[model samples]
Structures are given as C-alpha cells and as structure tokens.
Target: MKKESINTALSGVISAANNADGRLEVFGVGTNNAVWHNWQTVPNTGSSWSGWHSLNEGATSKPAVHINSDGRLEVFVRGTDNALWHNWQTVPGAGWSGWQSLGGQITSNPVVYINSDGRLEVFARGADNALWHIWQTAPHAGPWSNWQSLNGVLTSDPTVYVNASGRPEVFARSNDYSLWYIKQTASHTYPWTNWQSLSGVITSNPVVISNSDGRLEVFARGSDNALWHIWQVAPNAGWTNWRSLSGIITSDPAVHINADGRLEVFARGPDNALWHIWQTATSDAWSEWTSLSGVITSAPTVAKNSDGWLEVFARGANNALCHIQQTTSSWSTWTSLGGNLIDASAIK
Candidate 1:
C-alpha cells in the first residue's frame, strides 16, 4: 500500500464530489503532474461524463474537495513546490480561478474542511511533521489566513469531521502508530486544543465521517490487517472503544452514509476485491464483511446520485477508473470509466 495522503492516503487516487449543481466531479493528479478532472454531463446522470479536463496546476498530491457555503466547489492540493494550492469555481458550477498557492512547507497531502459558518479551512502534515492549518477569512470569500501549526507529530495526512454540534475535529496517525485528534474548542472562530490520542494501533491513515445521527466514526486498517473503527457514543459526546469488523484489509477504508442513513465502508481486501461492511442500520452494530468481487487496485471512493443509489469508484487492475454501482435491485460489475485515474505512487 502507498503512504497516506489526503484522499486514499495513496499519493493520487481519484476523489469524487457532487457539486451544488448535483453533478459528480472526479479529480486526480496526472502523470504529468498537472491536476485533472472529469464531471457528469448533467447532475446525477453519470452515463455521460465530461471528458477529462486539466486544471493544469502542477501538484505533488491528490486533491481535497469541498463545496463552499455559497454553492461553489473549491479544491485543494499540495503543489509541486511543497506548498498548499487551490482553485475554485468562479461562479457556482462554472469557470475556474486557475491555481493559486497558499504558502506552506508541507510534505503530505493537503485536506480541506468547511466550517459550519461557511468558511473553508485546510490542514496538512507540515515539513516538521507537525499538523498545520489555514482558513478562509470569510465564508466563500477570497481571502485566507496564514499557515498556522496545530502541533501534532503526524505520520499521515490529516482527515476531519465537523461534529454534530458544529465543531470541526481533526484526525491523524502519529509516529507511534496510534490515532490522535483535536477538536475546535468551541464554535467556528474559536481556538483548537492540543493533539489528543484516541489510542489505537492503526496501520493505515484514518478516515472519519459522521452518522445520520451526527455521531463521528473513524475507520482505519488495524495492526491486525483488519478494518477497525471507533466512534462517539452520542452526538459530540463520549466515544466507544475501537471495534473491529474483521476483514483482511489491504488499504484504508472509504466511507459514506446511505440514503437510508446507514453508514457503509469500502476497502481493498486481501483478494484485491472490493470488500465492504456497513451498519445494518445507523447504529454501532455492523454486518459481516461482504465482498463485491473485483480486482480493485486502489481504495474505493463512494458517491451517490440523485436517485439515491450509490456508485463505488476504484482503480481497475488495468489502471482504469473503474466503478460498480447499485441498479434497481443489485449492483453491477466493474465498468471502466477509461482514464488514468491514479498516479504511479497511487498504487505504490
């Protein structure tokens, strides 16, 4: 498996996000080092995806995406010069700002989180191994704050989940192979506390998402090579001990909440198939692992359509952007989206 970055923790696997317009946008760093992307021709309609378009910004990592409070979509990445860079839709769903670097001496993938107040914030593993962050001065507006340190000795790119109470919490893997996190001490403009440990022997980058009820769940590949997760017992409250939904995971887990409010997680298994486990409902309980057989070469990214059906994307053995999705009743097999969806180091 590759080292962790913003998305797959792998250098540059594809990341997909739905625009406010409802179209799905898939982005990745090309072999040429330029940022590239593709989107649905129309909202929620995936049969006709727009051809790959180059945002042309030279990057050393995968892009992190978030929709602005104002309906615009903004994307962030680590520039070739090791600085944080980003561009956004000039007008919601149209045009682009091209790329502009937000200075920082970072060595890992950069990630973005939208504050409850609509402002955007970014965090990454700085050159000194400490966690550093920056934020937008105003919601969906142009200006940003200078790079500031959150001070955690991180081993992987940081990931975040804004708590149900609207507090943004950051999660990361430390040098000791344990899980660590810090939450916004209060509302949007408040100071953040120092790094705190959740204490789990995770072997992969941690990925966090909130449940329909707003409890935060963080998943990772455990030292046992199984998929393990931990979450809060109540919205923004105490957390449960790390629990395993055993499976021979070969990569970090990717997750999303379903239309039914069930939390589903996808990962690459020892068999290279797309293996998954989910909440039978939106509770702490989970189902036995299920293999949605395919020789997936990367961690899967899941996104849903307007119809509420889900589509899971992964790199095929042939290096194509492959996906499997839910139809009227069952899921279809791997269908190649036909593109270079990952960098060489993505499968490194």
Candidate 2:
C-alpha cells in the first residue's frame, strides 16, 4: 500500500462506492455540514486522490454510497431537517445532480444496497423510531417510491446484506439494545418475514456479511463493550447463539470479507486506536485482536482494493481523516489524509 495523504480539509463520516469503470469515490459531511467528496482510480498506484470536493448539500448523519444497476453512483444522507436526501452522478467520473429529498425523519445513518436483481433499496430509523424503507422504481435512475414503514423501533443505523439466493436481510439494534433482523420472504419480491430477534445487548449497529460459501456472519459491540458475533450456516438456518469475540470497543464494528475468503472485522478501541481481528474462514477461530495503532474517533472502514490490499480509513485523533493498510506481507503506518472528520467511513 502507498504511504501518503489521500484527502485533505474535509470532515464527518466517510462513505465510498466503486463504479463499473474502475473509479472509487468517497463521500462525507464536510466541515460546512454539506456533502463532500473525493475519488481515486482503482489501483491507486500513486497520490491519485482528487482532494476534498463538496456537494454543497447539508446532512445530519453520515452518508451512504452505492452503485446502481445503471452504473451511476448514488449517495444518501439524513438532511439537517432529518429527512433522507440523495444525489447521484449523471455518469461515472462526471458532474453530479442536485440533492433530491426522500422525506423521512430519520435518527441514524442511511443504509443502502443494490440487489442481485439490480434494484436499489434503502433502510433507516424513522421519526417514530420504526424501521422505514424506500427504493428506486427504475433500475438506474428513478422516480423513487415513498418511504414505507417496516415497523421496528431501532436505535442504530441498519446494516444490510443480500444472500446468495438474492434475498435481502436487514439488521439493527432495537430499542432494548438487542440485535434484530428481518429478511425478504421471496426472492426478487417485496413481502418480508416478521422481525426475528437475535437477543444480545448491544451498544452499536450490527454489521452483517455473507461468506463466499453463502453463510451469514454478524458482528457488533456488546453492552459490556466487547465484540460479539453470531452466524447462520445457510439462508433461513438458525443463528448460532451470541458468542464473545472479546474486545473493548468505543464504536460500531465494520466488517469485510477479503479476496482470499478471510473474514476481517475492525473497530475503534477504548483508547481510540483502531483494532482488528480476522478468521481464515467462517469455520475457523479468530486471530487475537491486533491493535493497528492510531488514535481514531469512529469505527474504521476497510475495503480490499483492486490490487488485493486491505486499506482502512477513519477519523484521526485530531479529527483529520487518516489511513493505514495491509498487504500480504506487512502493514503500513497510519498516515493523515487531512480532514476534520466527524464520523466513521464506508467502502464498497
């Protein structure tokens, strides 16, 4: 991984999405409380960052980004008025359109996913504290549908993952601070199953990931501030009861599956340092928590670049964005990307 500053003079939680054309873009709430952006080519061989750029739209929560079926990049965030607002690129690596409102008073960050069937779906906690959703009617661009209430009182941002069969699952922390989720009853259809309880006292949002073999794994910070995990060997299979993975965390956990089938999880430790743990595969035990060693304020977001290096980004101690990376042989030192960030990060 290259050791250099990629972004400068930005702030808030960073979210990212990649296009079919090999462009990687990151979005965040700027110091001005508006959406800000930066992008780089897929391989990122040198100091290829676009620096900090703004969307000039205000947000109250960290933004989420996803590439739609039409190959256009879309970013979603909670507006200052607490409604969902979105903006998209007319084409990859080009000019962006104005912010469009989706109209729902949400309390947390928006979570979005494009299904295997090419439809876009978004989930968030509404003003009434219930889980609400909205989606695009058309594949690429849309006359997006109105917000539909999914009916669960949630306390954190929702996390979503689509199974191998194309069924989408949504997970979040309920009012009682336990993990709960609901899944679509039929593939490529709208009816959803009843919300199912996973029953563990958690302090942050739950992150879900499906392994290459199709099993689902979840990780979150327990009430005791330790990391916990649970899984389903296959779709609709019962989840293994909550088990402790053991770590003292200060923020929600971010998880990703590597190109080699390894499961890695990252979070901010009590001292505000980045911590990581991984398993060879879902069936293996995790490596002991390793301190990646940088003072950070939010959960760490990680993505495997086109070259297979695992790159991580977070809000540094000074509120500037910082990054570190790991290759097959060793890890790189944390370097400031230069932003006054307010939240965590997201990557696709």
Candidate 3:
C-alpha cells in the first residue's frame, strides 16, 4: 500500500463504520474539538479515502459510528456539555445534517448497538459512575427516548453485544476493578437480570463477541497487563474460569472472529508495537503472541473486507493514522495513512 497523508491534523480517537454497500467511513475529534470524517469514495477497493471533512460539530470525547437497520450511517459523541449528541446521513454519499442533541450527562464514550428486533440502543457511564441507556423505538426514525439507568458503579466505558439467543448483554469494569455485566431475561424486554460478576480484575474495558457456534467470548487487559479471556460454552450455561493469554499490553484488546470461524485479537504491546494472537482450529488452542511490526500509540481497530482479508488501523508513534493488513498467505508491512490521531478507534 502507498504511504500517503489523507487529511488535516486530527486529535483524539477514531471510530469507523462500513455501510451495507461496503463504503467505509472513519470519524474522529479534531484539534478544534469538532468531529471530522474521512471515507472511501469507492467501496471495498481498499483505497481512495477522501480527505477529512468537518462535521461542524464539537464533541468532548471520541465519537462512535454504526450503521442502523435502515442502512443510514449514525455517529454518536458526547458534546462539550457532556450530553450525547449525534448526526447522520440521509443515504450513502448524501449530505449530513446538523448535530442533534440526545439529553444525558455522560462521563465516558457512548457505545451503541442495534438489537435483533431492529431497535437502536446506546449505553454509557453517567456522571454518577452507573450505566445508563437510551434507545430508538424504531430503527432510524424515533421520538428518541429519555435516559434510563442500568445502575452499575463502573470505572470504564460499557461494552455491549446481543448474544446468539438474541439476548442483549452489557459488560464493564466495576469500581472494584472486577468485570460485571447485566442481561435481559427471557422476556427480551426491560427488567434486566442482576449484575453478574466474572472473576479477575481488569484495567481496561471488555469486548464481547459470539462465535458462529453460539459460544460467547469476552476479552480484556488483565490487571497484570496481559490478555485474559472467559467464555460461556453454550448460551445460559456457566462461564469458564478466566484464562490468561500471554502478552504485555498497554491498551485494551480488540477482537474479531474471521470468516473461517477462527478468533483473532490485536493489542498494543509494552514496546508500543502491534502484537497479535489467533486460534488454531486443528489444535483448538491459541497461537503464541506474534509481532505485526508497528509502533502504535493507541489500541488497534480491525475489520474484514468483503474479500475476507483483515485490515487493521492504529495511531502511529507520531500520532498519524497508520494501517496494515493480512492476506490468506502473509502479513503486510505497516503503511502510513497520514493523519494525527489522539484516541482509540472502532471499526464495523
């Protein structure tokens, strides 16, 4: 890949979203405190990302981007006043409207997910350090609801996912540094189950993903700075004990389950290099830590292209946006995409 700078200087973490048509869009907070965007003019070609364009809105924290059931791209961020603010596109390649306010005083970055029923849900840490939620009754259009507290004394941002059985689950690092979560009961409606505790103290946020077989997996940076994991053998079954995956990381671990049903995780090592580990199907065991060769300052964000190749992005030592990839046979050298980044990133 060619090393070329794409846009003006940007500050803070980046967030990404790929539309149904395969067009990829990345967002970040600029040095001016406003949200900025860069996207692929051509879909799935892995090239041609447009230069940064201002969204003309200010945010206090890094933004989050996700495509709703209606196929419209939505971007969420905490405003200067600590309330949730958002903006969206009418259609792919269309113009974006001004930022609209979602009333809530948050203390951390907001996370959003679309449930199986097509309801758009968002979770965040409130000023009181408890988990709070708000959602859109319909996919894209809604008389957006008011803030509802899930009530957990959290020390980190909340991560959420809908399990294979269509049960929505949320995970976070509690005030005690232990991992905690809550889930919707069989009714699949309100009245979530009591907060469940998982063994082991974690330093960063937890990321949860379910495999093709309906098995749920969660990964985080343990108190020792190594990667730790726990899984539920089957839906509603008990969770296995926390198992350690060797690595000395500085940021939270990012995980992805590839098209081949194999698990892949990426993290920033102590030396600021990109380190990776994967599950070997034949042995049913994890591969040892492997260096991907790049000096990154933030946690990596990864996504699989339409062609099944894995693309990873991170902020370089100089704070520029850099990227690398893996094909079926080999790993590519880290190439500079060119823009200074200030925070962790996300990908669809």
Candidate 4:
C-alpha cells in the first residue's frame, strides 16, 4: 500500500509566487542556505504530496518568477557570482531543461511581462546598476534577442504590467528613491518613452494591478517603512496622492484585488506571523490589520486555485513554505502546507 504523506507545516521562505492553467507555482530559498524547489504542487487536500523538483543549488536570495504568454514559467535568481540566471518549465508532460544564463550581474529580483506581440520581456539592473533587458518571440526555438540596456538607473527590482491600452509599462525605484516609469504607447513613433518620475520615494518593489473600475493600482512600501499605495485612473496625469495602509513593512509585501474586487494585502508581521488587511468590494476603506498565526518570512503570493479558492503562500520563519486558504464555508483560514523542512533551525 502507498503510505499517505503526513499533513504538516511547509518549510521554506517564499520569494515569489505565480499561478496559471490551474497550477500554483512557488519559488524560494530554504534557511538551509540553498534553493529548494523551483516548483511545488499545492493539492486541494489529504496528504497526497506531489514531490519536489530541484532548480538552482544556491538561492538564500529568493527567485523572481512570472508566467510567459506561452504558459511557460520563467524564473530568475541572483547567481553565485551575483549574475542573473534563467530557466523555465515549458509545459506539462515535459522535463525541465538546464538553466540558461541571462544578462550581467544583478542585485534585485527580475520581473517579466508579455509584450503586445506575445514576446517574453525580462528586465533587471546589471552589475553597473544600469537597466538591462532581453526578449524572445515565438517561432524561434533556441535563439533569444541580444541583451539591451535600458536608459535608466535603478535601486530595486522593476515591475512590469500590461496597461489597459495594451501597452507594457515598467516601474522601479530610482536611485533617489522616487518611483520611475517607462512606457511605449501605441501612437508613439519611438518605441520606448523617456523615463518619467512619479510622485513618491518608494522603498520597496512596486506591484502593479488593475482594479474593476479600470484604474491601475500600484502598491509599495514607502520610505517611512510603512505601507503606501498609489494609483492612476488616467495615465497621462500621473499617479494620485499616496495613501498609508498602516504598519511598518520590512519585507516586500504582496497585494491583490480578489475576485470580488476587494483589495487584499498580505505581509510578514512584526511577530513573524502572516498578516493581512482587506476592504470589501463595494467599500473604499480598508479593514484593520490582523496578524495570522504561522510565522512567515516574505510577502505572501496569492492565486485562485482550480476550484476557484484563493490560496496564499509565504516563507515561514522556519524557512518553509506556509500556506493559508479560504475555507469551503467562505471563512478565511490560513492553514499550513507541509514542506521538507524538519524544523526551524534545520532550515538554515
């Protein structure tokens, strides 16, 4: 008889999370001082564990990952020499290929976005602190376009989002700590727009998301170490005034407007617990901060599972992947998903 896997707490620090085609992808480094699983399965229930798949050997520094238009999951991590490395799970029923080298050295995580032509675009700051980018289009199996350096200086990982107008925009923290944005509008003769500085001194990488009202919301931790959020309903006029969401944010926090269109923010609490704040769909005000149990280390990455349930994963203080979910009864309950970490101390 096949023994059932025991249900327990997942061990690892979650650095990034993404979901597509009914699969939840998580990437993080273990306190054990090595990068553990590049991809792990989140089954609906019952100790039936889908085993672990290895990616990189070293990654105490979390890896950044995004799903490309081809449905492939592209992951980027700071290599041993401080350079950026790339790898992807092209599709189901296929084996994971060897890692590929991309770009020069990098300090922050890399972010990916699909261009209008369905090309995969990856951007990161090279060893010189200058912006570097690379892209690839379909029909070309093994060749990628040459790496190009964007004209800008960055201090943090940049974020990319496909705007409402079908344009891809990139934003990051400038050296002076102000928010910087680059875009290529449809009508512009020259492709890339001159970098524009937005209205805040952001201390964390920004998460760009669009709300139901058709407005694009950008969330980031501000220089004061507090959670600050900004948005642009009309792009040309720039972002609105920044709003503080309460609490001192240390790690890069995660935010997503749920299926009901409510703003939900998840972060590592001061007590190392998983913390969350949310607003009702029709309400404009956010709920008071609430700290959840299960020590967490990084921002919680959230996605809707195949069953339409929201699932979130974070790096637990024990260096394990800790997860919480909305119960079938509609009650919000953050539960633990077991990983290979035997204990907290062992993780490191």
Q: Residue-wise lDDT of candidate 1 within 221-298, one digit each (tens)? A: 888898889989888888889988888888768898877798899998888889888898655568899989988777
- Cα lDDT of model 3 by residue, 23-134, tens digit: 7778876667778888777765656778788887677877988887877888999887789998888775566867999988988788998878777888888887778899
Q: Assess candidate 2 and give its TM-score to the true structure.
A: 0.91
Cα misplacement distance, residue 245 of candidate 1 (Å): 0.7
Q: For all the candidates, what are their Cα RMSDs to the real structure?
A: 4.3, 7.9, 8.0, 9.7
TM-scores, all candidates, are: 0.92, 0.91, 0.91, 0.82
Poorly placed runs, candidate 4 (over 4 Å): 1-20, 31-34, 38-48, 56-61, 139-142, 187-189, 234-237, 281-283, 331-335, 338-348
Cα error, candidate 1, residue 205 (Å): 0.8
- Give the runs in model 2 whose Cα sits over 4 Å from its true position: 1-12, 41-47, 187-190, 344-348
| Candidate achieving the largest lDDT | 1
lDDT of candidate 1 at residue 52, scale 0 to 100 = 80
Better of 1 and 2 by TM-score: 1
Residues 51-72 of candidate 4: C-alpha lDDT, one tens digit per residue: 4455645552456666665566
For model 3, the stretches where C-alpha displacement exceeds 4 angstroms are 1-12, 188-190, 282-284, 344-348
Residue 144 lDDT in model 2? Answer: 85
